[PDB]
Amino acid sequence: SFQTQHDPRTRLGATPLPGGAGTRFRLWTSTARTVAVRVNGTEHVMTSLGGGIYELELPVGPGARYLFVLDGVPTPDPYARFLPDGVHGEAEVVDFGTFDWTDADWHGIKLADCVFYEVHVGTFTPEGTYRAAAEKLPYLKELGVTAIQVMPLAAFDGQRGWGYDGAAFYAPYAPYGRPEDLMALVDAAHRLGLGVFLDVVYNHFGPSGNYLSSYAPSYFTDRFSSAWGMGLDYAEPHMRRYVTGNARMWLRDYHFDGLRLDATPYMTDDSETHILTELAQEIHELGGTHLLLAEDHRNLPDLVTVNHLDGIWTDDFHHETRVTLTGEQEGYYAGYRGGAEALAYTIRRGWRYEGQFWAVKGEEHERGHPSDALEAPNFVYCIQNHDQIGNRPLGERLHQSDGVTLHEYRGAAALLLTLPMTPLLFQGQEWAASTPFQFFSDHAGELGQAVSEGRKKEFDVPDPQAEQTFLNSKLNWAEREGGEHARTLRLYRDLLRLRREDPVLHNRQRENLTTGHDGDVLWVRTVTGAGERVLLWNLGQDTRAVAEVKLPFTVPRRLLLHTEGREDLTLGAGEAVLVG
Numbered sequence: 001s002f003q004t005q006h007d008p009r010t011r012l013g014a015t016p017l018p019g020g021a022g023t024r025f026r027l028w029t030s031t032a033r034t035v036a037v038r039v040n041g042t043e044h045v046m047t048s049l050g051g052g053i054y055e056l057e058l059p060v061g062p063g064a065r066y067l068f069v070l071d072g073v074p075t076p077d078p079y080a081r082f083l084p085d086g087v088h089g090e091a092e093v094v095d096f097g098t099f100d101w102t103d104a105d106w107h108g109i110k111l112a113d114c115v116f117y118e119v120h121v122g123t124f125t126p127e128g129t130y131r132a133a134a135e136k137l138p139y140l141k142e143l144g145v146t147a148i149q150v151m152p153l154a155a156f157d158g159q160r161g162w163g164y165d166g167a168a169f170y171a172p173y174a175p176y177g178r179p180e181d182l183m184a185l186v187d188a189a190h191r192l193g194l195g196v197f198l199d200v201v202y203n204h205f206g207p208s209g210n211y212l213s214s215y216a217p218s219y220f221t222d223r224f225s226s227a228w229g230m231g232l233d234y235a236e237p238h239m240r241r242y243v244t245g246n247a248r249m250w251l252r253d254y255h256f257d258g259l260r261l262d263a264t265p266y267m268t269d270d271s272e273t274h275i276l277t278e279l280a281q282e283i284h285e286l287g288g289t290h291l292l293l294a295e296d297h298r299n300l301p302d303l304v305t306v307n308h309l310d311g312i313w314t315d316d317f318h319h320e321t322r323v324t325l326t327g328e329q330e331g332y333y334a335g336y337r338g339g340a341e342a343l344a345y346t347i348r349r350g351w352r353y354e355g356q357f358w359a360v361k362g363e364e365h366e367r368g369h370p371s372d373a374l375e376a377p378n379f380v381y382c383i384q385n386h387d388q389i390g391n392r393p394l395g396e397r398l399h400q401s402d403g404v405t406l407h408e409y410r411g412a413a414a415l416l417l418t419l420p421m422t423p424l425l426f427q428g429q430e431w432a433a434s435t436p437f438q439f440f441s442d443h444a445g446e447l448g449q450a451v452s453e454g455r456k457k458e459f460d461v462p463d464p465q466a467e468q469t470f471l472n473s474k475l476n477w478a479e480r481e482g483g484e485h486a487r488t489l490r491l492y493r494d495l496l497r498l499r500r501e502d503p504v505l506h507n508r509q510r511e512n513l514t515t516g517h518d519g520d521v522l523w524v525r526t527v528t529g530a531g532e533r534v535l536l537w538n539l540g541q542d543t544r545a546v547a548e549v550k551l552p553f554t555v556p557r558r559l560l561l562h563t564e565g566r567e568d569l570t571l572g573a574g575e576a577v578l579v580g
């Protein structure tokens with residue numbers, strides 16, 4: 001009996017009318033005294049309906065250009081479905097009914113079947129567009145990933161950016177392509193049997209192009225702040241519906257299979273029904289199989305068990321892994337010892353911090369909650385993602401950090417890709433890409449200068465505002481064809497094939513998973529009715545024979561995969577083997 005709060009009849013923004021009657025324009029404003037729509041250059045006074053609601057229908061169709069005029073001030077539509085001249089410009093009317101979908105036989109993807117591949121549209125290809133990205137879909141399918149995780153697409157200011165400065169949440173960022181180019185990308189992925197997930201940012205708006213306060217200051221609150229401005233007020237139903245409307249758009253209208261909610265700890269809401277709960281209600285009302293993941297550092301199972309999200313990006317695994325390989329201790333890396341015993345524990349528990357004191361200076365508190373309620377697929381694990389690369393001063397990848405070998409990098413892949421937790425890969429990870437993923441932006445004027453200065457002071461650091469920083473982060477596809485890149489790629493292919501094919505690795509129950517260590521050798525054991533598998537990873541500096549590893553069970557004898565392609569059951573420094 002949950003009823004969506006959304007009715008296409010009353011949708012804010014510009015919506016094509018039935019029977020070729022044109023377009024219905026609607027907005028909410030709490031403060032304007034005069035209200036008009038300017039369509040293709042001509043102003044028309046809008047009708048006041050009460051509650052600050054304004055409406056007008058005109059015989060203009062899809063492609064018409066418009067913005068609103070509030071007390072005589074031309075103001076972009078926060079509900080714009082496309083912004084071909086960027087975030088300060090006219091919106092375009094978009095008709096979602098016109099695209100010829102061919103994906104009727106696609107029915108989404110379960111979390112337990114996801115192997116995520118995180119894509120940044122602007123750097124994934126030379127062109128940095130959906131159309132170029134679509135041409136790489138067969139490669140991704142053959143690689144063995146099953147779900148593309150697309151970094152945010154909401155329009156932001158400038159000609160490149162990560163996407164976290166999104167300001168017009170309903171409008172796909174024009175430099176990447178037109179709405180129909182995005183649809184073409186999703187449709188193509190579905191035809192290849194790949195899921196497509198979108199990163200969405202419901203905890204803040206970017207600093208340039210967010211005009212919501214021009215309509216109603218009450219979308220926001222001074223009670224708390226975001227990175228960029230006033231906090232998003234989830235006590236205000238129009239603010240609630242701005243994001244639930246947006247979620248429903250991406251899933252229903254663009255055929256996304258799921259959403260990754262950025263920084264959920266900062267979606268502050270003291271309402272009886274939390275916004276996260278209402279988001280899950282709203283997306284499920286669509287009557288599909290769409291998923292919701294949270295990027296949440298609190299180690300809080302209630303995200304799944306109470307808000308009814310599907311899973312959580314849980315960095316404890318990532319952090320324990322990186323500290324194991326580098327020994328680094330800056331910032332949140334100080335929360336982890338690393339090493340075989342530490343990794344065994346973190347995997348055993350899903351996340352490490354279940355309520356114990358987090359001693360990181362400046363952040364001290366009792367962090368996390370018991371993980372018992374959560375099942376293996378509920379944890380999303382990785383050894384690389386946009387933040388864990390880009391939030392480093394030089395944006396270097398794991399194999400490029402000081403004191404990491406390619407052997408260790410390959411061992412880390414075997415651990416990640418054989419665990420029953422839901423894995424994510426960052427673009428180019430699979431071939432040990434030579435290119436960094438640096439923080440880049442392209443804000444205007446004083447704001448751009450402030451970003452450059454901010455980055456410099458925070459940590460030569462590449463200037464986020466420089467074109468070179470963006471270009472240096474572009475994938476070099478040709479390099480995967482050779483040398484160690486090709487070697488790494490072969491291993492990734494073999495691992496993803498084993499994950500797909502191996503009847504014991506199909507396990508998705510923490511009940512069947514055990515871990516432990518002998519010195520610097522980590523072991524991870526899976527036992528089901530289909531058989532037994534053991535992953536051994538030598539995290540030491542010396543050579544270890546599998547036969548000499550002390551285990552509380554008899555080690556299986558058949559060598560299924562060795563990260564360095566060795567014939568014998570022996571582990572060089574940093575190497576791993578799967579036995580069965």
Ligand SMILES: OC[C@H]1O[C@H](O[C@H]2O[C@H](CO)[C@@H](O)[C@H](O)[C@H]2O)[C@H](O)[C@@H](O)[C@@H]1O
Nearest residue numbers: 300301302303305369370371372373374
């Ligand atoms: O404060 C948030 C929640 O804390 C508890 O929930 C966590 O801890 C429980 C045991 O301490 C677990 O059973 C549960 O799965 C965790 O989410 C508390 O039980 C919840 O009511 C609180 O909302």
Ligand SMILES: OC[C@H]1O[C@H](O[C@H]2O[C@H](CO)[C@@H](O)[C@H](O)[C@H]2O)[C@H](O)[C@@H](O)[C@@H]1O
Nearest residue numbers: 323324325326327328337338339340342
């Ligand atoms: O060598 C001095 C450091 O030894 C430990 O850190 C190393 O050993 C860990 C396993 O116990 C690894 O995860 C880490 O990468 C190594 O640097 C100790 O934990 C550190 O505090 C010492 O500085």
Ligand SMILES: OC[C@H]1O[C@@H](O)[C@H](O)[C@@H](O)[C@@H]1O
Nearest residue numbers: 297315316319331332360363
């Ligand atoms: O992973 C734990 C870390 O998550 C980060 O995203 C938080 O901003 C930081 O405060 C915390 O140290």
Ligand SMILES: OC[C@H]1O[C@H](O)[C@H](O)[C@@H](O)[C@@H]1O
Nearest residue numbers: 030051052218235236237238
């Ligand atoms: O501004 C007048 C009213 O507008 C809308 O109803 C908002 O949902 C409400 O919270 C506000 O009180």
Ligand SMILES: [Mg+2]
Nearest residue numbers: 518519520550
């Ligand atoms: Mg020993």
